[PDB]
């Protein structure tokens, strides 16, 4: 029920769902979550991939979203982040809502966390967890990957424009010294790297 308010008023949260601004806002909200991990001093690389299947991945080398079950809540902290709107201040719509809104408006979302020597994943359909967050391997790395398929029920157009993403990612690179920002478009075999060390 945590995501019901977003399913009911997608436009209020993400912006215009027709003109493509709301659609690209979905990527920017996930990137903003990775930028916060960089501002916290924990992340210095963010990779945005537009996939052949038209889904988008955002991967960071941050701490990784915490995976521990808060008995209070009964589920992994990550599931709380993905299925409950935060309480802080917040293309039209709201700026800084983060991944909960993106989850709600995605037909599918796949979460991978690299944390505490372990690889954890969870899948959502339209914001509903399909199974509890689970361990699937070991890793020496840390960070978070969010891959999402924006809902064809919510957005009249679902094809990401590599130029709109590239232009905003260059602004963010300039605004965030020391963060290596990579954009990959597998549809056209493009890679851009923006690295402003300052
Ligand atoms: C979408 O998640 C975002 C994160 O996005 C990314 N890409 O990392 C990032 O923006 C930021 O991530 C934080 C924000 C706060 C803490 C944080 O305070 C940590 N400190 C702890 O000792 C800790 C350890 C376990 C634990 O369950 C929690 C609370 C869990 C939270 C805040 C989800 C905190 C920690 O390890 O990781 C943190 C992380 C990874 O805030 C989220 C979780 C909403």
Numbering used by the authors: 28 to 117, 126 to 233
Provide passages from the article that reported this PDB entry.
Bacterial DNA gyrase and DNA topoisomerase IV (topo IV), both type II topoisomerases, responsible for the ATP-driven introduction of negative supercoils into DNA and ATP-driven supercoil relaxation and decatenation, respectively, are validated antibacterial targets. Gyrase is a heterotetramer of GyrA and GyrB subunits (A2B2), while topo IV is a heterotetramer of ParC and ParE subunits (C2E2). We have developed compounds with a promising activity against Acinetobacter baumannii and Pseudomonas aeruginosa, which are both on the WHO priority list of antibiotic-resistant bacteria. Cocrystal structures of 1 in complex with Escherichia coli GyrB24 and (S)-27 in complex with A. baumannii GyrB23 and P. aeruginosa GyrB24 revealed their binding to the ATP-binding pocket of the GyrB subunit.
Whereas fluoroquinolones, which target both gyrase and topo IV, are widely used in the clinic, inhibitors interfering with ATP binding to GyrB/ParE subunits have not found significant clinical application, despite intensive research efforts during the last 70 years since the discovery of novobiocin, the first ATP-competitive GyrB inhibitor.
